[PDB]
Design a protein around this nucleic acid. Structure first.
Ligand SMILES: [Mg+2]
Ligand SMILES: [Mg+2]
Ligand SMILES: [Mg+2]
Ligand SMILES: [Mg+2]
Ligand SMILES: [Mg+2]
Ligand SMILES: [Mg+2]
Ligand SMILES: [Mg+2]
Ligand SMILES: [Mg+2]
Ligand SMILES: [Mg+2]
Ligand SMILES: [Mg+2]
Ligand SMILES: [Mg+2]
Ligand SMILES: [Mg+2]
Ligand SMILES: [Mg+2]
Ligand SMILES: [Mg+2]
Ligand SMILES: [Mg+2]
Ligand SMILES: [Mg+2]
Ligand SMILES: [Mg+2]
Ligand SMILES: [Mg+2]
Ligand SMILES: [Mg+2]
Ligand SMILES: [Mg+2]
Ligand SMILES: [Mg+2]
Ligand SMILES: [Mg+2]
Ligand SMILES: [Mg+2]
Ligand SMILES: [Mg+2]
Lengths: 177, 52, 136, 84
RNA sequence: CCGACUUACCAACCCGAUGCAAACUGCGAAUACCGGAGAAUGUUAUCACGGGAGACACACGGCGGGUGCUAACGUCCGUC
RNA sequence: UCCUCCUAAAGAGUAACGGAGGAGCACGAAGGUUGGCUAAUCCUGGUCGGACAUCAGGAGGUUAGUGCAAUGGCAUAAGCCAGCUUGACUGCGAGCGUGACGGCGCGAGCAGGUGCGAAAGCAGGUCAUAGUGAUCCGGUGGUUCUGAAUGGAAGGGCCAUC
RNA sequence: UCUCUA
RNA sequence: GCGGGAGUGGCGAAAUUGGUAGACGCACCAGAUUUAGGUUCUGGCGCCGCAAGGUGUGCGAGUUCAAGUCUCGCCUCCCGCACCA
């Protein structure tokens, strides 16, 4: 709750200043963080899905929800109902604590890290990024793993526009560019 | 017409039986249902037997 | 030759052709060729009258065709008895009621539109007349 | 020699008429259990003292006169039995 | 690598205008049909049961239609 | 032979070697109940990831879905998830529909015993309409109903069923 | 064992 | 005119209940053998294409998550049949 306290004390005062909002409830806030791993290669073996969920459970201390195919497509050789990915929804304190470990540990551990994009805000403030390699989190042991996975992080916030989320993350010193 | 026919014999000692069908390929395990026995006027477990 | 690209069904009842028409006013262009009689116009008759007025205007001006042949017409072959199914689709017609504007034209003078539509109506089985764009 | 004989018609079939419709109209006194409407869907719907069958058949649960009426936001047609 | 621009080969959606449909309907009759009430009229014309049948090859004409060529003293249905 | 639509003329019904399509099953859950949920498609962003997997938001508002053909229905969902389960009960059935008949169908309610639900209540198979075959003959289980002098038995009858 | 032609 | 059947690479030919399409062979190309050619031996080989992928069963739409296989229509070829007066 280190960043939640830092939000409640300094970000709200900052955004109320830099936007001149009538109410404090009009301010943005983060709502959830969704962690998807689309594993399309589990049609070869279930164990690839079963170990990627084990890896993502170490990153965020939750058991992941194994997602399935909404429908059947033949270009990918899948039928409707096959377990095809895994997700984790993060809310509350576990959200803040992961978001701390993200921008403090894992983003610096990116090979050739040079910033994020400010063109990844889905028109309505909600930010989405994708990491190339799961070893940037220190939860994973390097010798113990075998396969380089990848996941994508999706921060869903209550910002109406795109810039109010851009300023919110910049208030959390989020390394755009 | 792969869905063959069977009979559900009362386990109450009576020779009462309901007749019904099943797919013996996909459901190899025996069907056991709790049905009414009009002789005993109780609900008793019936078990799958051959239609014979 | 005009013809629907797709149809939901291949054949149609013979129907009737009673009633007055709906495409009465000159919508788009300035001059029109209005049907007075009743009947059906084939796609050949339509395309021949289009050719006769396109040549009569020397591709000057713009020509609309208000009608479209969407009714399939079956025929039985020669030396075939009256049973054994409905005949094969041979051609396509448009049912024409009185008042239907068949063609429109502008970009040309009135007298030229008169002589073009006269050359076209001489290729059409039904009796026509010449109309102009009326205000209201 | 010449009777080019031939053809057929893949389209000879049709089914039997199920005799659906409204068996008792409005203002028409019925006994309890009398079938009012036989129908596929719920083209009509059951109101007061009117049951809906397995095949969406509307029958009278009581005795009295048939009342057709339109209710609801969807403007659906309800059939009710007035008391008598 | 990005592609620079202009074409005429066009063109999705959307918008406006305009037609068509037996197997289209955000509308919708006339008639017909069912039920109720009320006169007048009609040799109960109505229903039920029982005795005896015949008939189940129809025709044209009108209207609504299918098929055919909106051909047939054609053909198949509905109604008189 | 059966089902769906049109022809079919706004009740029912209505023919042709008229126009078009399907059925001769499936399901022990794809049934019952309680509780909850709500689609197709498209747009933007996003690791492998691509026209099209999974993820987040927005438009949209059922253009989807319904075990299968078509039509009619479906948000109180009849559509989609999970829990518990066997009402895919037995005897009856007022009263109606439909047929020349054989026959087919709907059915509240009654008695018994049951399942879910806190409960009101719901459940006598599946959203409905196709998924089928008379009688005879013969087989199997049950039942003293009968039992050709008498007692049994055979055989027959009745019930279920092939 | 087989082994054509220029 | 009626019905049954088939149409795939340069060629002959396969594929199953719809889960990529070319297995195979012939030919063609190239290599080595040989004084040279043939044979014989090895390796390639549907079309566009940057090495990475795309378009591809007669033609046109449909069906399906997905067709060579399902529909339908058009087409071409083969066969059989086209009778009594
Ligand atoms: Mg003959
Ligand atoms: Mg109509
Ligand atoms: Mg007769
Ligand atoms: Mg007769
Ligand atoms: Mg006669
Ligand atoms: Mg007659
Ligand atoms: Mg007549
Ligand atoms: Mg006629
Ligand atoms: Mg005639
Ligand atoms: Mg006659
Ligand atoms: Mg008639
Ligand atoms: Mg009718
Ligand atoms: Mg009528
Ligand atoms: Mg009509
Ligand atoms: Mg529910
Ligand atoms: Mg995506
Ligand atoms: Mg259900
Ligand atoms: Mg159904
Ligand atoms: Mg016999
Ligand atoms: Mg005895
Ligand atoms: Mg004796
Ligand atoms: Mg020599
Ligand atoms: Mg294949
Ligand atoms: Mg002879």
């Amino acid at each position: 709750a280190k960043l939640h306290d830092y939000y409640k004390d300094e970000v709200v005062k900052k955004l109320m200043t830099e936007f001149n909002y009538n109410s404090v409830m009009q301010v943005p806030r983060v709502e959830k963080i969704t962690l998807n791993m689309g594993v399309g290669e589990a049609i070869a073996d279930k164990k690839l899905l079963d170990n990627a969920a084990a890896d993502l459970a170490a990153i965020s201390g939750q058991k992941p929800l194994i997602t399935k195919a909404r429908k059947s497509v033949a270009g990918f050789k899948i039928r409707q109902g096959y377990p095809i990915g895994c997700k984790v929804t993060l809310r509350g304190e576990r959200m803040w604590e992961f978001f701390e470990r993200l921008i403090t540990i894992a983003v610096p551990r990116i090979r050739d890290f040079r910033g994020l994009s400010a063109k990844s805000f889905d028109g309505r403030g909600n930010y989405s990024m994708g990491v190339r390699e799961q070893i940037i989190f220190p939860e994973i042991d390097y010798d113990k793993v075998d396969r380089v996975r990848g996941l994508d992080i999706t921060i869903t916030t209550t910002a109406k526009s795109d810039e109010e989320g851009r300023a919110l993350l910049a208030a959390f010193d989020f390394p755009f560019r | 017409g792969i869905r063959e026919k069977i009979k559900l014999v009362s386990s109450a000692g009576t020779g009462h039986f309901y007749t019904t069908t099943k797919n013996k390929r996909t459901k190899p395990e025996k069907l056991e249902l709790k049905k009414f026995d009009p002789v005993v006027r109780q609900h008793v477990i019936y078990k799958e037997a051959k239609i014979k | 030759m005009l013809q629907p690209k797709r149809t939901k069904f291949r054949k149609m009842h013979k129907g009737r052709n009673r009633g007055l028409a709906q495409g009465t006013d000159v919508s788009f262009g300035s001059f029109g060729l209005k049907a007075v009689g009743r009947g059906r116009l084939t796609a050949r008759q339509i395309e021949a009258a289009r050719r006769a007025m396109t040549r009569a205007v020397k591709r000057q001006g713009k020509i609309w065709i208000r009608v479209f042949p969407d009714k399939p017409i079956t025929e039985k072959p020669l030396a075939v008895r009256m049973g054994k199914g409905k005949g094969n689709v041979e051609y396509w017609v448009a049912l024409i009621q009185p008042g239907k504007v068949l063609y429109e034209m502008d970009g040309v003078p009135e007298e030229l539109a008169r002589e073009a539509f006269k050359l076209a109506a001489a290729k059409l089985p039904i009796k026509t007349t010449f109309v102009t764009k009326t205000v209201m | 020699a010449h009777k080019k004989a031939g053809g057929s018609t893949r389209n000879g079939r049709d089914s039997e008429a199920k005799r659906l419709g409204v068996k008792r109209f409005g203002g028409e006194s019925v006994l309890a259990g009398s079938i009012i409407v036989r129908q596929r869907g719920t083209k009509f719907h059951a109101g007061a003292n009117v049951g809906c069958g397995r095949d969406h058949t509307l029958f009278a649960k009581a005795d009295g006169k048939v009342k057709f009426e339109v209710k609801g936001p969807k403007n659906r047609k309800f059939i009710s039995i007035e008391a008598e």
